[PDB]
């Protein structure tokens, strides 16, 4: 029975740039426990119909955790721009799988997680689909080196969600969990319950 | 057998920064959280900042809150902490620590963390 | 100053019984979080000694014991060696600081 649960209701979730990735495989999987009393729960998928997954049969599954604000939800998706889809998360526009998404307000708003929550927001290039840039080096924004210190042009690459529940909305956070369903020409190890 | 090697110590002056780094072996190191736990010449024990099994960040000492960033890779089996704005208080040796429970825990439950295996600490020296 | 108490100093001669006492607040002791017990020598790294309020990692000698009540925690060691004489930390989590904490450590002789 596959490990669900451990990821989707985990007591911390990961930093958007440092997401976390789970694989799930060699278990039997019981997709109609995706679901939660978290008030705007959100279920999208691309290229795959949810109501077939369990007679659906797949090589592998892996599970990418992590929190957003809600604005940015809709960054998780194929061929999206924004900071988040450019520098933290990228899908690829091919994409096949399914984002779930919730508010987390009672969760990771608390003054004492303030720090617990960051993004990427200065980057050289975009990051690849699918790749992950946990580096804490300053950002040279312009023509001086920077000499390991910030400073004018020269910025730390991490910013801090700092989340409140006064907050609206759009600026609490939100947890995610993006599904990606591997088929490869080799036996299945992780199957629905009906097959 | 359970190893952690710390590195990424040295001396360094203050408002400078500094990356540790952990590497874990000896265990399945994405069942785990990870720890970071100082400690001054002739004091105390302070915990710096955790890590849970799923990247999570637990929480940051109050003294380094905003200044300290970890994270882990669980791939290469690495707990790594970005040390920025050091201070001269910020000197101590820094203890890469496992968690005792490979219990993943849920929302709803309490935490609980205790480390059972330590490593042996890298020197972080902030001085001008 | 750590927001688990301890003793900064216990003694006592071999052979007698000795305890350690770790006192903390509404937030994390009397939250129920659990409490854990370190050991550690001079020069050398910690070493877990109780878990979980009460279990002794194996190889650690039943003459230690740990109980929780309330705000509070204890080490109980009582068949005092010359070994014992180490520095011990007691150590929980913290709900209003979201992090673990460590007590201030103790001290502990055995008067020779």
């Known amino acids: 029975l596959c490990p669900f649960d451990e990821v989707f209701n985990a007591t911390r979730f990961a930093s958007v740039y440092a997401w976390n990735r789970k694989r799930i495989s060699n278990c039997v999987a019981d997709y109609s426990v995706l679901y939660n009393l978290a008030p705007f729960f959100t279920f999208k998928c691309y290229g795959v119909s949810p109501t077939k997954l369990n007679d659906l049969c797949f090589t592998n599954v892996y599970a990418d955790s992590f929190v957003i604000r809600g604005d940015e939800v809709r960054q998780i998706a194929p061929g999206q721009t924004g900071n988040i889809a450019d520098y933290n998360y990228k899908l690829p526009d091919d994409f096949t799988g399914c984002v779930i998404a919730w508010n987390s307000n009672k969760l990771d708003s608390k003054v004492s997680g303030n720090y617990n929550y960051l993004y990427r927001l200065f980057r050289k290039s975009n990051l690849k689909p699918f790749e992950r840039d946990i580096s804490t080096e300053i950002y040279q924004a312009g023509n001086k080196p920077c000499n390991g210190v910030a400073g004018f042009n020269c910025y730390f690459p991490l910013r801090s969600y700092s989340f409140r529940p006064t907050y609206g909305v759009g600026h609490q956070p939100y947890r995610v969990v993006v599904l990606s369903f591997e088929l490869l020409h080799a036996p299945a190890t992780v199957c629905g319950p009906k097959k | 057998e359970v190893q952690l090697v710390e590195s990424g110590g040295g001396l360094v002056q203050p408002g400078r920064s500094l990356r540790l780094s952990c590497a874990a072996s000896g265990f399945t190191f994405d069942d785990y959280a990870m720890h970071w736990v100082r400690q001054a010449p002739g004091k105390g024990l302070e915990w710096v900042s955790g890590?849970?099994?799923?990247?999570?960040?637990?929480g940051y000492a109050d003294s380094v809150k905003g200044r300290f960033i970890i994270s882990r890779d669980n791939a290469k089996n690495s707990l790594h902490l970005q040390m920025n704005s050091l201070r001269v208080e910020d000197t101590a040796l820094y203890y890469c620590?496992?968690?005792?429970?490979?219990?993943?825990?849920?929302?709803?439950?309490?935490?609980?963390?205790?480390?059972?295996?330590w490593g042996q600490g890298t020197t972080v020296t902030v001085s001008s | 100053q750590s927001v688990l108490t301890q003793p900064p100093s216990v003694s006592g001669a071999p052979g007698q019984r000795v305890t350690i006492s770790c006192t903390g607040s509404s937030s994390n002791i009397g939250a129920g979080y659990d409490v854990h017990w370190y050991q550690q020598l001079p020069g050398t790294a910690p070493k877990l000694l109780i878990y979980?309020?009460?279990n002794r990692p194996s190889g650690v000698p039943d003459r230690f014991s740990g109980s929780k009540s309330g705000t509070s925690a204890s080490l109980a060691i009582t068949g005092l060696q010359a070994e014992d004489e180490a520095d011990y930390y007691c150590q929980s989590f913290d709900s209003s600081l979201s992090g673990v904490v460590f007590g201030g450590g103790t001290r502990l002789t055995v008067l020779r």
């Open positions: 620590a496992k968690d005792n429970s490979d219990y993943s825990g849920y929302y709803w439950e309490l935490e609980n963390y205790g480390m059972d295996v």
């Open positions: 890590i849970t099994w799923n990247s999570g960040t637990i």
């Open positions: 979980d309020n009460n």
